[PDB]
Amino acid sequence: LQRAPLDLIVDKNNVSLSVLQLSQGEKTILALIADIARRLTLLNPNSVNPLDGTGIVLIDEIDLHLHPSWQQNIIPRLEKTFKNIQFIVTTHSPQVCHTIDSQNIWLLKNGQKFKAPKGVRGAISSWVLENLFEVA
Amino acid sequence: KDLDNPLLKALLAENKNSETTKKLLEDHQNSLKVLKEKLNSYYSVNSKTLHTVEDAMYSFLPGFSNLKLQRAPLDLIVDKNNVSLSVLQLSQGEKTILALIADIARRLTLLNPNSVNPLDGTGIVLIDEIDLHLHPSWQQNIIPRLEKTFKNIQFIVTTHSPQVCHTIDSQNIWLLKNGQKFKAPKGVRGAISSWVLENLFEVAQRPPEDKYTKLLQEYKNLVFSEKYASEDARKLGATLSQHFGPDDETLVELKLEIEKRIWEDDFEKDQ
Amino acid sequence: QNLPSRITKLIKKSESGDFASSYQLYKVFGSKEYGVEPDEKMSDYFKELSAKQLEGGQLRVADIHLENYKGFESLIMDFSMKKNSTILVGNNGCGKSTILDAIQKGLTHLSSRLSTRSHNGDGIEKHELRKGQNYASIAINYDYMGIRFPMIIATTEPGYEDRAKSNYSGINELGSIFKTAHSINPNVSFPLIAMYTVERANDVSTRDIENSEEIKEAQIWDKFKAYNKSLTGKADFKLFFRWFKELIEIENSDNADITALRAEIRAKE
Amino acid sequence: YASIAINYDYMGIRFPMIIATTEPGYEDRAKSNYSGINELGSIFKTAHSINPNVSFPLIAMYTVERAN
Amino acid sequence: DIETTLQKAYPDFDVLLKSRPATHYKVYKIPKRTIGYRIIAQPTPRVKAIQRDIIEILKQHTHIHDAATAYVDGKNILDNAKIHQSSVYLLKLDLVNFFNKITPELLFKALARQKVDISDTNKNLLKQFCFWNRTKRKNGALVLSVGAPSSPFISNIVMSSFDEEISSFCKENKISYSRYADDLTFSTNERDVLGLAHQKVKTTLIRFFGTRIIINNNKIVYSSKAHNRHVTGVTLTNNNKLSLGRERKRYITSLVFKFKEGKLSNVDINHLRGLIGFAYNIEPAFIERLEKKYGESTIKSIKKYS
RNA sequence: GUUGGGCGUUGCGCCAAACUCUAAUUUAUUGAUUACAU
């Protein structure tokens, strides 16, 4: 923390910068993780690990402000850090889908629920795109 | 003013059993509906040069028609698949595209007062994160239609998805590295999205952390390591064939290689 | 004294180990209504056991039923329990946001009855009715340690007699269980309920951090307070900035009285 | 728990009120009851109807901030 | 034929007529196996006799449609699953407002459709002696109570044309119908036809009987041979058999085995007595299998235990 | 993932078998049924 204009300072690549001037794709994730951590700490009193709580977290449109290099490491990292929280989410980026089992993805079209085809886990992105979004 | 008088509310509360008065109340509500319907019917008849602006927003959102508002409590009404409904309850991406195109069209028609084709003006439009709320079906179509509806407009934009960044020729897409500017390699105008991800965004098509990806890597290592049937190719094949399915163009090739290796050990028995 | 057979079954279930089996055992032995004489000590024991057995359980949403909601005529989904991640994929205009908006308006009710005494929450507005229909209904089943809680929230246009009345039988149960567990032990872990809407794009700004040291002091530090403005989206950062200031101040204010104490020990030696 | 149980009077029948607030958890040990004061307010509301210029009581408090 | 024979037995019908006999109800609460408290209002020990007598009088001129195994004489829970054994699919309804919303306005017109004539004084007697007032005040709202001895038969009469029409519809689509109070289960052999049955039952529940009761849009459950399938406690096997279920099947045999070793207290001897007696009304075979495995000398010690 | 059989270091461990319309049974001092004491 830096107390002159009551602002926070974070270091990247040996460069000191304020949070208010960071990239738009790195403050949304920052605030999301900070809010989850603070709420878990508040709701769970003194314990060995206060981030092991339960509940429902609904991350809507996870693909916001994310390069398609973190989308392959966002869901498993949330599950690794928070290993006891349900994470019902919605997405449109086909590089988030190919990290979860096929039985979990719930396709939606024309007001109806369709199960995902077999083998939606780690595979060629073109195949998941073609067989889950109907886009060539 | 008359129907909201406190005396009327007091009279209604005093006598709950007011079926005779309830009939008059329903007659008043019918008059409400008739008057509102007439006032709205005095609207949805004709239009003006606004039709040209309207045609700009029906192309980017297929299945949309009959955009008016309501002279009853204010709201804007669309028609989606013969279902008239309010604009306030449209999808997030639909509203984003609608607002964007409507604003640009309004600007273009106000700058150009008198033209046969007001909608193709000269100017600069900058878009940040064009792939914010868009399905991949619209991502590979957003720009080719954008350059067609608006012709003489520069569209310097930033993207975060391969689907949108494979409809533009390789010489007009700019890559910002750690500290320097680099140009894309040739073969982006009509290439496969996997190639664009692999050689433009530096990301593997297969997640290099999942258990199944590592199992496939070990299987591909073992098939070509002169032991194509040493019980572990067997175990991993029995796993991956059940997982992915017997028909995928990643394991069909490698099973064909295994079959060729099986054949290769037939004539060598006499040796 | 001929303890009723249902009471014996509940005692056997509690011996096997369940949280509701002892809940309905400290409320059967604490009143004359349920049919058995009230014994206070042996009801207090069951209450303590019920609160003790709540630890280690995960609260998850099992199934959901939409009827004449925004865009779905009749929808039934079942979320996996052995898996901790469900993903909705579809076109822009199919209704994946509708299911999340239906999970809220019930999660709001659960949070309200788990934290506050208001017994109020969200509901189906007139503009969310399916165009042409008159009635709508959302049903959600909440899970905890294999024991499920029903719920249903419905509405009817004010021209026809209501054909779907609201019912919140199980969420009152869950809130009462958690509140009793808190009563016997102040440090019982509670579930987290929150949604992050797309409006978190503009979450962090200089305006929010400018006046983050000008808020109420009692709005951040208590267990029952991490529920306000938590299902409205817009992941809060002002309150986080205040919280971070207070924690860094605890580190920068203590650990110096520790240094002062060490200096005092050296001086006394 | 915490409860304020002031009791009012209008030259006659006592009109009670309990203002209580308990932390979530220990909830059954103190509850509010506004029955009498609601009745008294209804009495004055009816009084204003039968007689438009009916007398009402004066209620006011003054902290130290009167002249500061 | 109610007022004529009302004073024949216990000629105290002159009193208790104006002294709100519907108010004569005790309310208690039983704990469910899971979340929930069940309010039950039962009459005073005197009113039950009158209610049983008037049930017997009413039974003289009534008819109850079949496929509704809801408290009809000589029809246990097994015949409910006997009809459903030959099916492959099931759609289990569960009605809401358990008997607590069936107003007396919906019984007199049900009898009128039933083509039975009732006197105005007899109508007042039916409204006054066979219902419960929750508000306990004069000119209140009368609702049927879960616990009154007169609940089953009136609950059956109020749903008679619905049952007939739903059975007629199910016959044309090869669908088996059954109903225990409010446990409507629909079963079929054809694939993807249960949606039509659900739509039909929804549209007929809101037309004859009115918008009074509705389908609980929470416990609507689907099942097949892929997963577990049950019809009122009875488990239907994939091999087309009616059994209790493996957990209970092993519990009973473990208890009867422990009987032989003599390591069981007298409290659970009554438990085994009840369980063996009950394993005659669902599975007539299981005890024969125990005889085949453990022996007749083992079984014929609990059924006649001293 | 669910269902029926078998053995006995039996308030259930193991063995041996099967099935997948996108989709698992809970109420008593009440009424119906099995059973002992009458």
Ligand SMILES: Nc1ncnc2c1ncn2[C@@H]1O[C@H](COP(=O)(O)OP(=O)(O)O)[C@@H](O)[C@H]1O
């Ligand atoms: N009153 C209504 N009548 C008809 N359709 C409605 C009505 N209200 C909402 N909808 C439908 O709800 C859809 C909104 O989609 P939405 O819930 O935002 O999911 P997503 O954001 O993933 O596209 C729209 O396709 C719209 O047609």
